[PDB]
Ligand binder design. Structure first.
Ligand SMILES: Nc1ncnc2c1ncn2[C@@H]1O[C@H](CSCC[C@H](N)C(=O)O)[C@@H](O)[C@H]1O
Ligand SMILES: Nc1ncnc2c1ncn2[C@@H]1O[C@H](CSCC[C@H](N)C(=O)O)[C@@H](O)[C@H]1O
Lengths: 342, 341
């Protein structure tokens, strides 16, 4: 069932394709030393080896680490990949010198060139492992310093962005509920549709939203440089974005349906992320191919939704919002999304 | 919970069986129908569309209140009465009280047909059969009070539990080995065995590939829905004997095993059929998938991997005793136990 979740991630072709391409394009992998943080099945470790890495350290805390040793052996890669079955944090606690002392023969004169990881949670942050990736990065930079090696570590992915967009719920309601319930062998069961829908919204909605829900193409909220981001940043994630709904292609879709006296109402905001390396981008936008992340949608209170308290004339208007991504405890792995309209 | 109801309304097999039985039945038009556990009221509204004189729609949950609106939204309010109550509570009100409250709708003929979708997993588990039995008996008392002794037509009229021995290999191959064998040139097939084995130890409810059958299946338990009583649901067991020497399904695997070979048995799969007139609703692996899927009981992993239950390629005899036993007093929840011999 651990493996069932990993199988989900391995079936994510967009996810798989971004990492395979990024790894094959790095000029820092061949002949150099790679660390894979949170390696799971070891797929990224094994890709790095095939790409000609000198040696790979594959770090995995769970009991998958023991089976990964077997699969590495089954793929004849046991000399190029070392599995470390422990948390990043416990490896760190063992210290810089002890790391170098245990694996010096594999490190040789080279140090760590590349840090591979797939840490992204929902909107990058929620149920992710970014804080462990940051700790790993800082630790291996100290390991490099102790080896007298001064080259900075390549992060893959190297950059991450959070995107936000205002939505109307109508097309999600119509496509996922009303379309089915309105005609059940010629019977009108649409009253049941309103019910099923209203109660599912009172579950942070994590679902693949039809793109027609977008009232605007989306704006950047938070952007990260993965070589420089520090834990401190995860304590104050907030920004204010301004959606120009005038002359927005997305808004016009709905403006045409409203009629000349009609109004288009905002029911909430949907949130997604991109990460990138070199020429490659992995996107979880509703406009991109589906991924196991889907998107995360934050709704306005039902009072605001049903009475359409946030609405716009057919010509559009301006929509400002301040959004907070707030840690709900001290791990910085769990977050809540809070917003206030301008 | 309407999401579970959508799932049942999206089950094309389940829906066509009931739509066809109701629209092809000769006891509905001009007659009085009871829908026991009506939920959305689909079976009731179908009964009204088929020309029923009147329909009593019984639904215990708060769906009943919305069902009234939907009966109205489809212009059927004179033809369908929603009784938002448990079957058991309506019975407790007594016969004479029912007859007096609804005397004009019963008319002179009383209840002719009792519609219901009560089937759980392997017919019994998380099903609603005891309420259907109680309803049937109650409305036959109502009929008797009106001088009608004609027995009530049950839809479905019959139900059968089937069992068949299976091999796990094709399920392993199709749902595990095929994916894990090559992940971009990597052999992750070790992960495949682990995911598979660990999933088996967590009553397997799943769509088994038809190639898993070592035999077409035999009847374990058969019910006449006009006559079945609650007492029967406390002692459900039987013994079936599979002649694998005469099974086409076994011969299939015997050929793949080759002239020198053994065919191994990894467990038993259980499904059900219900029927009415010319129509059968089947949840067999050889039939289109339904939300019931099938239920599979595996032999101990020791037996499976050491192939402790096996047959030479010409076949042999496989006898098994099965118990379907209620795990509490509701007669809604059950476990399946089996012994080879
Ligand atoms: N602090 C930590 N130290 C070591 N492993 C960790 C960790 N936090 C999470 N993990 C592991 O990191 C993995 C992230 S899922 C990523 C799996 C794999 N790299 C892939 O791309 O397919 C999980 O297997 C989890 O067990
Ligand atoms: N003892 C009981 N008395 C009245 N309603 C019951 C009941 N037990 C279960 N129900 C209701 O019966 C329904 C059965 S599932 C819905 C069946 C519906 N006729 C269909 O074929 O789609 C559920 O809505 C449940 O709430």
């Amino acid at each position: 069932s651990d493996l069932a979740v990993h199988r989900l991630m391995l079936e994510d072709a967009q996810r798989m394709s971004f990492y395979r391409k990024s790894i094959e394009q790095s000029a820092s992998i061949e002949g150099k030393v790679v660390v894979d943080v949170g390696s799971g099945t070891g797929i990224l470790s094994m890709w790095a080896a095939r790409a000609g890495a000198k040696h790979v350290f594959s770090i995995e805390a769970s009991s998958l680490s023991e089976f990964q040793i077997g699969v590495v052996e089954d793929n004849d890669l046991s000399t190029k990949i070392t599995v470390l079955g422990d948390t990043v944090e416990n490896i760190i606690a063992g210290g810089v010198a002890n790391f170098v002392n245990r694996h010096k023969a594999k490190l040789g004169k080279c140090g760590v060139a590349v840090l591979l990881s797939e840490w992204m949670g929902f909107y990058l942050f929620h149920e992710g492992m970014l804080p462990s990736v940051i700790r790993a990065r800082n630790f291996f930079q100290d390991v490099n310093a102790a080896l007298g090696v001064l080259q900075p570590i390549e992060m893959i992915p190297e950059r991450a962005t959070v995107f936000v967009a205002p939505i109307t719920c109508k097309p999600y309601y119509v496509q996922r509920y009303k379309n089915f319930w309105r005609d059940v062998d010629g019977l009108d069961f649409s009253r049941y549709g309103r019910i099923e829908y209203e109660v599912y919204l009172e579950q942070p909605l994590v679902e693949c939203l039809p793109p027609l829900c977008l009232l605007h193409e989306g704006l950047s909220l938070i952007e990260l440089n993965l070589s420089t981001v520090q834990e401190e940043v995860l304590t104050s994630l907030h920004n204010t974005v301004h959606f120009d709904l005038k002359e927005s292609a997305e808004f016009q879709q709905h403006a045409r349906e409203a009629g000349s006296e009609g109004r288009v109402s905002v029911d909430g905001f949907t949130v997604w992320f991109d990460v990138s390396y070199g020429a490659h981008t992995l996107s979880t936008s509703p406009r991109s191919p589906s991924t196991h992340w889907k998107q995360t949608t934050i709704l306005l209170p039902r009072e605001a939704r049903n009475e359409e308290l946030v609405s716009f004339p057919v010509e559009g208007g301006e929509l400002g919002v301040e959004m907070h991504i707030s840690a709900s405890d001290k791990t910085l792995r769990f977050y809540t999304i809070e917003l206030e309209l301008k």
